[PDB]
Amino acid sequence: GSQTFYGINYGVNENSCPTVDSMKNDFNVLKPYTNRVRTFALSVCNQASLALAATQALGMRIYLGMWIDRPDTFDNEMNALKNILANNDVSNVDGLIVGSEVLYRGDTDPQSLANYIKQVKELVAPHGIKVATADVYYKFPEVVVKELDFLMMNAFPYWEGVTIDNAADTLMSHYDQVVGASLGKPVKISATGWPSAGGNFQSSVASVENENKYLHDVLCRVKQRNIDLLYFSAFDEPYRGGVEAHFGVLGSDRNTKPGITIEAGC
Ligand SMILES: OC[C@H]1O[C@@H](O[C@@H]2[C@@H](O)[C@H](O)O[C@H](CO)[C@H]2O)[C@H](O)[C@@H](O)[C@@H]1O
Ligand SMILES: OC[C@H]1O[C@@H](O[C@@H]2[C@@H](O)[C@H](O)O[C@H](CO)[C@H]2O)[C@H](O)[C@@H](O)[C@@H]1O
Predict the structure, then answer these.
(1) Per the CB 3.0–4.6 Å rule, which of 113, 166, 190, 254 could disulfide with 134?
(2) Which of 159, 192, 194, 218 has most ligand 2 atoms within 8 Å of its beta carbon, as the pocket-test mutant?
């Protein structure tokens, strides 16, 4: 069952940073279901350095994310990347995700993002690390795609008001659109998930039964087409509030969630 998830997204509380041992304990709980995790920032809580130590001690692999929005974050994250290359083994890194939903938010223009990606690639390619960026299905302009090794899609049919019966079918449809913008490069999925509590979004209903269904459907669909998927997310995160506090496969105290069965639908 350590093949059930290709990988899993792992959240971090910036106002209450973990330790190496605390990360090791967290990743340990996940080991029966996966061998791979993903972090969202390099410098924040020094999380990238600590997660490399934790994954390596446990024999696991990792995707490393760079968090860029405000102008200063471009300098800070690049300096953190340089420190990582000098202070860490990186042989267990499957990719570097340069920004997440940068174009969706309008943090910067397409040409500027392409230039930053180009600089990142020049630094890590001799270390043997492939580069991507993550964004919504309608935000992959050619000028950005030209600089990538591969593409990663964030897509949540829940935030689209899509009903649970149609949700995984819609995910796959959005995937086909990213392929259309891919220039023939490989396409992966960096994030999708479904909340267990916190109300509804139009016809999209939040419940334990629905998260269970969505998990089964997506795992089946990506297996049929040989698509690599990072599920969102590992544990519930209360400090986000409301619906955003209920995306975990497991609970906030690292116990299992009653009603969730971890398995693929085919
Ligand atoms: O802590 C770094 C940045 O994290 C951002 O939230 C992330 C979300 O975009 C993503 O979808 O989920 C992960 C894990 O739950 C979050 O870390 C914040 O929005 C940023 O303000 C923050 O700098
Ligand atoms: O609350 C805003 C959230 O919006 C999400 O983007 C949505 C996509 O996931 C979804 O597939 O499409 C719709 C537009 O058709 C987007 O709004 C982000 O993924 C979240 O990070 C964000 O919090």
Answers:
(1) 190
(2) 159
